[PDB]
């Protein structure tokens, strides 16, 4: 319905705002762009499903996220990809993993504070009806 299309449009507006707040955080700059195949040639072979905040913005606009769960799955993928690809004890690896975890925790925290549980429940019920 028109009511349902407005629900999903509100979700997209909410998701864009949260995503922008993450993308402008200096700690999360590494997660704002795809990994460069020139700089990191073995990335696309080690990491089967690359994800970054620019790709998240594209997916919002392509209507790929019908619930906050769908969105958080991709946030979680940014984080898990960073932990997998940079698992070592060295300072460069430990810094990216600390940043990955903060990106994840930050997103979860914004959603917990600012996304109404009944709004999310509605999204889930419309989605399940499709
Ligand atoms: Cl840096």
Numbering used by the authors: 979 to 1108
From the publication, what sentences describe this entry?
Bromodomains (BRDs) are protein interaction modules that specifically recognize ε-N-lysine acetylation motifs, a key event in the reading process of epigenetic marks. The 61 BRDs in the human genome cluster into eight families based on structure/sequence similarity. Despite large sequence variations, all BRD modules share a conserved fold that comprises a left-handed bundle of four α helices (αZ, αA, αB, αC), linked by loop regions of variable length (ZA and BC loops), which line the Kac binding site and determine binding specificity. The four helices form a deep cavity that is extended by the two loop regions (ZA and BC loops), creating a largely hydrophobic Kac binding pocket.
The C and N termini are highly diverse and may comprise additional helices that extend the canonical BRD fold (e.g., the sixth BRD of PB1 has an additional C-terminal helix) or largely extended kinked helices that are present as C- or N-terminal extensions (for instance in TAF1L or ATAD2).
